[PDB]
Curated annotation (Swiss-Prot):
Protein known as: Syntenin-1
GO molecular function: cytoskeletal anchor activity; frizzled binding; identical protein binding; interleukin-5 receptor binding; phosphatidylinositol-4,5-bisphosphate binding; protein heterodimerization activity; protein sequestering activity; syndecan binding
Effect of substituting K107A: Disruption of the cooperative binding of C-terminal peptides from FZD7 and phosphatidylinositol-4,5-bisphosphate
GO CC terms of this entry: adherens junction; azurophil granule lumen; blood microparticle; cytoplasm; cytoskeleton; cytosol; endoplasmic reticulum membrane; extracellular exosome
Keywords on record: Acetylation, Cell junction, Cell membrane, Cytoplasm, Cytoskeleton, Endoplasmic reticulum, Lipid-binding, Membrane, Nucleus, Phosphoprotein, Repeat, Secreted
Amino acid sequence: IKQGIREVILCKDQDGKIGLRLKSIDNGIFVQLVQANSPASLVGLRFGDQVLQINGENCAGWSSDKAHKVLKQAFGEKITMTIRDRPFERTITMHKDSTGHVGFIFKNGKITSIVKDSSAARNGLLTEHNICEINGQNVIGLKDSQIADILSTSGTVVTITIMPAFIFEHIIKRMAPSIMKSLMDHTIPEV
C-alpha cells in the first residue's frame, strides 16, 4: 500500500470502456471493480483505490452515479486520475511453517480465526478482515478453494492485503457475487 497519491493517464478502449465501477464511501469515491484486460487494469488501478480527481475535478461528495456519468462524458482520447492507493487496506508479510501453513482460517474470503503460535499470530493478522490480494494478486470473488490453492502454490514468503469486513461489505454492496468471480481482474499485471 503506497502511503502515496499518484496520477494515472487512461485511454478508453475501442468500445469506449475503461473497465471501472466506482462506489461512494464517506464522501470519497473508491474502486469497486477493475475489469480484466481494461484500460483501468493496464494503468494498474486496484480494488479499494480512492479516486481524488478525474480530469482535475475533485470527486469529494459525488454519488456513485455522478462519478460513472462523468467517466461516460470524458473526451475518450485521454483521462487523468489522481489516485490514493488502497487507503482502507494494509499488507501483512508472513512465512509458511514446514507443514506449509501461515496460520489462519478464512470463510467467503473473511479471516475468522488466527492459529496460536503461527506466523499469522506473530505478525498480528486480524479476524473479521476480508482477503483483498495475495502476493499482489486480486482474489476477490474467487471460491475459498482457489484462495487456498493460490496460498499452497505461493512460495514460503506470503504477502496478504486485507480490509476491515464492515468497509469491504460497504464497497461490494450491489455487485452480485458472480460478477465479482466473473469479471474482477484476478490477473498478475503485465510489464
